[PDB]
Amino acid sequence: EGAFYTREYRNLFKEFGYSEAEIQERVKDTWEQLFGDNPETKIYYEVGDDLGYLLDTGNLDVRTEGMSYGMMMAVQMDRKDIFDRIWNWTMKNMYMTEGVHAGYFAWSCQPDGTKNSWGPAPDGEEYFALALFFASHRWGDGDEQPFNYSEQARKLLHTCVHNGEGGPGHPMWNRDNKLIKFIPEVEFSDPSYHLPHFYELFSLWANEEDRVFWKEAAEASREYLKIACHPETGLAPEYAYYDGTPNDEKGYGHFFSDSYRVAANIGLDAEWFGGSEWSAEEINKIQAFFADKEPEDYRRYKIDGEPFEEKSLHPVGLIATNAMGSLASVDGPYAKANVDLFWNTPVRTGNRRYYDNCLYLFAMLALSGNFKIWFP
Ligand SMILES: O[C@@H]1[C@@H](O)[C@H](O)OC[C@H]1O
Ligand code: NI
Numbered sequence: 003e004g005a006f007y008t009r010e011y012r013n014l015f016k017e018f019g020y021s022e023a024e025i026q027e028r029v030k031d032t033w034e035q036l037f038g039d040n041p042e043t044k045i046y047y048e049v050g051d052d053l054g055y056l057l058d059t060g061n062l063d064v065r066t067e068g069m070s071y072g073m074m075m076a077v078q079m080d081r082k083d084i085f086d087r088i089w090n091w092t093m094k095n096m097y098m099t100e101g102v103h104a105g106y107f108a109w110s111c112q113p114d115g116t117k118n119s120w121g122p123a124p125d126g127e128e129y130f131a132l133a134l135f136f137a138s139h140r141w142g143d144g145d146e147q148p149f150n151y152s153e154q155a156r157k158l159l160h161t162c163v164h165n166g167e168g169g170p171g172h173p174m175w176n177r178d179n180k181l182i183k184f185i186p187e188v189e190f191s192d193p194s195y196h197l198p199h200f201y202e203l204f205s206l207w208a209n210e211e212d213r214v215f216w217k218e219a220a221e222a223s224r225e226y227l228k229i230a231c232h233p234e235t236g237l238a239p240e241y242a243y244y245d246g247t248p249n250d251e252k253g254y255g256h257f258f259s260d261s262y263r264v265a266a267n268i269g270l271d272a273e274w275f276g277g278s279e280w281s282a283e284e285i286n287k288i289q290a291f292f293a294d295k296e297p298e299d300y301r302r303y304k305i306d307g308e309p310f311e312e313k314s315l316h317p318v319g320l321i322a323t324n325a326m327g328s329l330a331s332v333d334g335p336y337a338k339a340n341v342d343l344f345w346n347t348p349v350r351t352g353n354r355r356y357y358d359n360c361l362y363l364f365a366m367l368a369l370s371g372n373f374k375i376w377f378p
Contacts, residue, residue: 004275006202011371012273014328018341025370028345032366033079035349036359042351045359046072046084047113053094054087055113059356063118064111066096066126071360073133078367078374082141085133086149091115092130093148098122102170103186105161124174124182125195127162131155132200135207136376152207159208163215179244180215180222190249193230193238194263196223199271203375228280231264232305236287238264239305248305256310257303262320262361265327270368272330274375282331289324289336297321297347318350318358322365329368341369 005011015025037046045068048054056068069092076085095115096107106122107130138151148154165171165186172186184192201220205213229246231238239248240260248255265288268281291307292300300314314320325344328337344365350358367373 004273004277006274006375007276011374012329012332013371014332014341014369015345016370017332018338020345029366029370029372032349032363033075036363037075037081037084043349043355043359045356048087049091052087053091054084055091056088056360057113057356059352060354061110062113064091064095064113066092066107066109066123066130068356068360069096070126070129070133071364073137074129075363075367077133077136077140077376078372080140082137085137089130089134089137089148102172105158105165105171106174106186121185122174124162124185125192127158127174128182128195128197128200131158131162131208132203134158135203139376139378155207156209159204159212159216163212175215175219176244180219181226181244182219182223184241190241190243191226192241192254192260193227194240194260194267196227196264197267197271198223198227199267199274202275207378227264227268227284231284231287232307234287235291235303235305235307236284237261237291237303237305237307255305257305258314259316259319259357262316262323264323266323266361266364266368269327269329270373273368273373277330282334285327285331286334286336288327289331289334289340292320292324293336293339297343315354316358316361318347319361321347322358322361326361326365326368344369 016022035043045056047057055064056072058065058068069088072088073085095111098104098106098108098120101120103120103122108117108120109123110118134151134155143150143152162174165173174186175182181191182195184190198220201216205216208216230242237257238261239255240258241249241254243249272281297317300317300320302310302312321344325340328340331337349362
């Protein structure tokens with residue numbers, strides 16, 4: 003039974019022989035390297051006395067993906083000051099009050115706050131919402147907006163499901179199949195975007211009129227992942243049609259950057275809401291596929307396993323996600339090897355560190371039993 007029921011979180015590092023002391027030190031060090039004053043590795047930048055943001059070092063922009071990640075990270079680390087700085091920046095510079103996407107958040111902004119687009123990224127919206135629910139539960143709803151956390155979360159999720167009824171907007175979930183979409187105006191998805199465990203919680207805290215829908219979304223996402231992941235390799239494409247097959251129209255139909263998060267999501271869902279036969283077997287397939295492969299040689303692969311000449315742009319993130327997946331198969335034949343590989347992998351430096359490091363800290367929290375559900 004998941005931690006949702008027991009309220010006890012598995013410390014996989016510890017179960018695999020690591021000392022509690024070293025684990026505690028490592029988790030804190032990972033945090034400082036990302037949010038502290040460590041230019042070579044940090045991804046979080048403070049601005050003034052009330053603003054802050056995560057920088058996509060590789061594209062020199064601020065993404066809701068990063069901001070939502072930063073907020074989730076801050077609440078897990080019980081750092082309201084960081085959470086508030088980031089959320090404040092998001093509402094001030096990313097929240098859109100105009101255009102067909104009003105009510106959502108511009109997916110990419112320049113460091114000075116200027117919007118690069120008026121299009122949103124659904125995976126950011128879903129992270130903002132849960133992060134906000136957790137903030138409300140850990141610290142309580144702030145008196146002045148937009149710090150009225152739970153109200154902002156329910157408000158945002160309302161838009162995500164009902165947008166397009168009272169106007170020209172589009173919902174972020176297809177109302178018929180209950181599946182999250184790549185972006186509001188398309189009818190296809192992105193496997194890494196599916197977070198059944200997040201929806202389960204939304205089915206408890208979102209507006210009551212949508213609680214049934216969210217329970218249905220969680221179930222729909224679990225089924226979706228079964229058809230999206232290759233049956234032999236376990237690899238999922240970055241983009242995929244609702245039918246499950248890859249959408250390679252623009253080159254996103256293979257196993258690359260986006261895809262890595264699938265294994266992490268499966269792991270966290272298993273820890274929160276319980277393991278499943280499918281999840282364990284899925285992780286065993288992915289890890290098995292990488293068992294005879296060296297990090298320095300990780301490539302972009304077709305989901306059937308065929309290798310491209312191109313190397314993985316974020317091999318450290320891949321390592322972190324495969325390790326985090328071990329939560330869905332603690333007795334798997336490669337579980338220990340993956341956790342050890344991650345432990346022996348340093349936080350990344352360079353202009354491509356952003357994505358790797360985000361996946362890195364999430365894996366560190368989850369594997370140490372510190373990526374928890376915060377109840378009212
Ligand atoms: O924003 C991320 C980008 O920084 C990385 O390079 O590829 C995956 C994206 O999600
Ligand atoms: Ni030590």
